[PDB]
């Protein structure tokens, strides 16, 4: 299969695919790590300039993306990449043949779930060390405990407590020990999306119905609910900027913005991402900034902002609707015809069944 | 940004803090009755004595204005300027000012109200410092020349931008300008934040309330074609209707 004359360099023209991208901070500023099949990309958020690409094409497609400060954790088939600057520094190959579904980072641990309803735990070799390389254990979710593992999050101020959410319910573990410290009861709907919160103890859950549940663990109680008529939720995010605002991303492409204090939707964005390609695949507020980065399956990655509020006297009541900011797009469909445009190999025209040039 | 716009923004941060004495004779000289040559030469105590002289009659009309004599119209409440206070104190100042404004919104045909709020204009710059509540509490009086005077004094916010041609005008602002003022969407979010504020505080009187329905109704009159603009207009009106029906009041 190997060529002698040519060799692969990169697949030019891709921004994302739909795999839920991760956000990270360097100091005060933000980077974005998205997936394109077997190759991930890194962006500044303040310009959507491309920062890094993968050093290697992975042998299978990346399933999950998490990102801490300098270390981006990719997760393809059985193995999980610890990448600094897009370079494979440590491959962590899990001791199953089950496929890696989800992943999370907290403490001296890494936690990544597979589709055998079992999560693997990877300690750092020391807290002095920075990336987790020691294999700790594998814990599992049997079908009296929970359903199929939808996400692993770590809600803050929870000492070694791992929050594994399923389509059914929520579990909490001491990953030093390996003991299930709490099981939540089933929510009667099929839970599809998790998100931690800038308030304590709360995990937000968007189900297969149009319902978002704020859920406590110190209470163990579903404190508030939020309805959506006839839409399947895909992403949840919290605007931690200075007014409490919640982001509901459908798989219909629509982005819904709530203010939980006014108990009211603020504006629903329609069709920022294509419904057939997954709807809105992942939208996330940049932490402590009024900027939400949205990502669709249409090879597109947009940014939106809340303008600061026009009401001098009110503020929080009168809210400017979200507004288009910079975006890197690609061809949503595969490209039908390409050509080399210029003489100095600078530009390439690419036309697709997306019915556009690029 | 440019430097000049970044510096004219600092004019908006200190539009009331008079530093040069000409800034004082600009900032003190505008008030609700007095002409600016006689309004230039007013001592603070002299205006506060007229303030109490209208405020005592107002408090005797209904006792709810008696509490602003304890705080706002106190004899100790002369020397304190706003900009000397912390913003957490400034928020409570604005709370007192706002709750006074929807209160006096009923009593505004009285020259007692005009002589009472003119001191608040002059002691607390509420034509500039809190002008959204000044206009929203006194929006229905658009035919009255007391309000028309008030238009020439208010630093106009972006939300009340239909009257940018009516500050320092002769003829009063027309009825269609009330619709074009209300035909904006975020203006209606301000009017919810006014009327919902008046509902819990139970300061809801009939004439202004009839002006509310006549403006909201004319908005849906103007949105008879723009059905998508109407479909973002259901959340602002039906919330006002629902929270309106939680009142004990029957006119509401």
């Amino acid at each position: 299969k190997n060529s002698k004359i040519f060799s692969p360099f990169r697949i030019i023209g891709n921004v994302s695919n739909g795999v839920p991208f991760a956000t990270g901070t360097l100091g005060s500023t933000f980077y974005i790590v998205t997936c394109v099949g077997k190759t991930f990309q890194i962006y500044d958020a303040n310009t959507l300039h491309l920062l890094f690409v993968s050093e290697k094409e992975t042998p299978s497609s990346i399933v999950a993306l998490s990102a801490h400060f300098h270390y981006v954790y990719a997760a393809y088939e059985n193995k999980v990449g610890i990448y600094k600057r897009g370079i494979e520094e440590h491959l962590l190959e899990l001791e199953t043949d089950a496929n890696v579904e989800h992943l999370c980072i907290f403490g001296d641990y890494l936690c990544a779930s597979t589709d055998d309803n079992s999560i693997f735990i990877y300690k750092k070799s020391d807290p002095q060390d920075k990336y987790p390389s020691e294999f700790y254990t594998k814990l599992t979710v049997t079908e009296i405990q929970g359903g199929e593992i939808v996400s692993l999050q770590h809600l803050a101020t929870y000492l070694n407590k791992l929050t594994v959410v399923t389509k059914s319910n929520v579990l909490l573990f001491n990953v030093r020990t390996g003991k299930l410290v709490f099981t939540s009861n089933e929510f009667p709907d099929q839970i599809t999306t998790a998100e931690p919160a800038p308030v304590l103890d709360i995990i937000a859950l968007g189900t297969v119905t149009g319902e978002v549940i704020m859920f406590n663990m110190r209470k163990g109680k579903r404190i508030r609910t939020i309805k959506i008529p006839q839409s399947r939720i895909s992403s949840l995010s919290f605007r931690t900027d200075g007014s409490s605002h919640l982001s509901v991303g459908t798989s219909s492409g629509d982005l819904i913005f709530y203010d939980l204090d006014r108990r009211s939707r603020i504006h629903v964005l329609k069709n920022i991402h294509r419904e057939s390609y997954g709807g809105v695949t992942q939208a996330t507020f940049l932490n402590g900034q009024p900027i939400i980065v949205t990502s669709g399956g249409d090879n597109s990655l947009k940014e939106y902002v809340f303008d600061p509020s026009l009401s001098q006297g009110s503020g929080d009541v009168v809210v400017q609707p979200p507004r288009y900011l910079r975006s890197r797009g690609g061809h949503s469909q595969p490209p039908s015809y390409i050509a080399f445009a210029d003489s100095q190999s600078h530009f390439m025209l690419s036309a697709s069944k997306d019915r556009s040039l690029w | 940004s440019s430097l000049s716009d970044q510096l004219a923004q600092v004019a908006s941060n200190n539009a009331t803090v008079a530093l040069d004495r000409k800034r004082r004779q600009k900032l003190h000289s505008a008030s609700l009755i007095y002409n600016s040559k006689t309004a230039a030469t007013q001592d603070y105590d002299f205006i506060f004595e007229n303030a109490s002289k209208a405020l005592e009659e107002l408090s005797q009309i209904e006792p709810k204005f008696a509490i602003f004599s304890r705080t706002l119209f106190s004899e100790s409440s002369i020397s304190l300027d706003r900009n000397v206070q912390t913003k957490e104190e400034i928020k409570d100042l604005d709370n007192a000012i706002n709750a006074y404004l929807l209160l006096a919104s009923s009593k505004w045909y009285l020259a007692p109200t005009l002589h009472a709020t003119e001191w608040l204009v002059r002691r607390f710059q509420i034509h500039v410092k809190n002008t959204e509540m000044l206009l929203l509490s006194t929006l229905n009086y658009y035919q009255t020349p007391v309000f028309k005077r008030i238009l020439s004094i208010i630093k106009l916010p972006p939300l009340f931008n239909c009257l940018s041609n009516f500050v320092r005008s002769e003829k009063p602002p027309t009825a269609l300008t009330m619709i074009k003022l209300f035909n904006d969407m975020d203006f209606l979010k301000l009017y919810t934040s006014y009327l919902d504020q008046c509902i819990k505080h139970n300061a809801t009187y009939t004439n202004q309330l009839l002006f509310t329905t006549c403006c909201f109704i004319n908005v849906v009159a103007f949105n008879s074609n723009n059905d998508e603009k109407l479909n973002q207009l259901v959340p602002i009106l039906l919330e006002i209707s629902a929270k309106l029906l939680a009142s004990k009041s029957k006119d509401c």
Binding site: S28, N46, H68, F106, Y158, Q289 | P158
Partner: peptide, 26 residues
């Protein structure tokens, strides 16, 4: 109403350090 986009810079804020959560052995 003057509906104009303003230039929006990213200001700095703070988030929880999830890498501070582990205590070692006894």
């Amino acid at each position: 109403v003057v509906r104009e986009a303003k230039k929006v810079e990213m200001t700095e804020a703070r988030a929880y350090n999830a890498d501070a959560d582990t205590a070692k052995a006894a």
